[PDB]
Chains A and B, each alone.
Chain A
Amino acid sequence: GRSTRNGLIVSKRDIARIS
């Protein structure tokens, strides 16, 4: 996932793909 000041960002598609 992309890294941001707020924090690392993970897409919903990634969550489904990993899951």
Chain B
Amino acid sequence: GGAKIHLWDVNRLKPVSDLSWGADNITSLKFNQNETDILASTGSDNSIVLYDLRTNSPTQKIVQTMRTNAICWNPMEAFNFVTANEDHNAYYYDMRNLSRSLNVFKDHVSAVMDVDFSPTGDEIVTGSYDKSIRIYKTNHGHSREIYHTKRMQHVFQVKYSMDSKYIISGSDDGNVRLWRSKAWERSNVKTTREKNKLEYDEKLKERFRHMPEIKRISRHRHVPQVIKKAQEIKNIELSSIKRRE
């Protein structure tokens, strides 16, 4: 994907086929993992274009209020994909009906630069210019967790370890960092007693998830001060619009 989206074969030095919806350039692309013949692309005019190799032509296009920097297809859902957008939001889309999004994620304060599905398909991780990595549950619209440190300067690549147990992050400081998918979990093999005891904490926590005290403890995170001031002012801006409208 450059000025034009081109299909290539390894054994042919020239581009085998030329795909293009229009004169616009293409910023990113991602093949599907289940319907491998379907491809999606991102354009600089704030557009998302879908393609099918079986027809060798683009299939559908939708224009957004802002550019999408990355697009990831759900490994467990062939028709379902997520898009990293420049309005601090990640949008979850069903291919067949693109007039609406399936879900929206809002917890970042800078444009999300990369997004990745867990190979299990039930979590998504997002990387943003705001020096943070967020993990979202697929059916929930807010991140369950935030990762950060001074030493990471701008997230541009975020990936899930193919076993779904770790997160790989790439930032502009020149370091590729590894993160646990779940901070409290440990990779060591557990005894059946530990497995049952550690499991019990989960359902019991899920059992009383919304209790006031547990919400105070469970939700709480150490967020960098730069992010909250962005969040706090953002909430003020949203409230003024809502009180207004």
* Chains A and B in contact, CB within 8 Å: no
Chain A residues close to B by CB (< 8 Å)? none
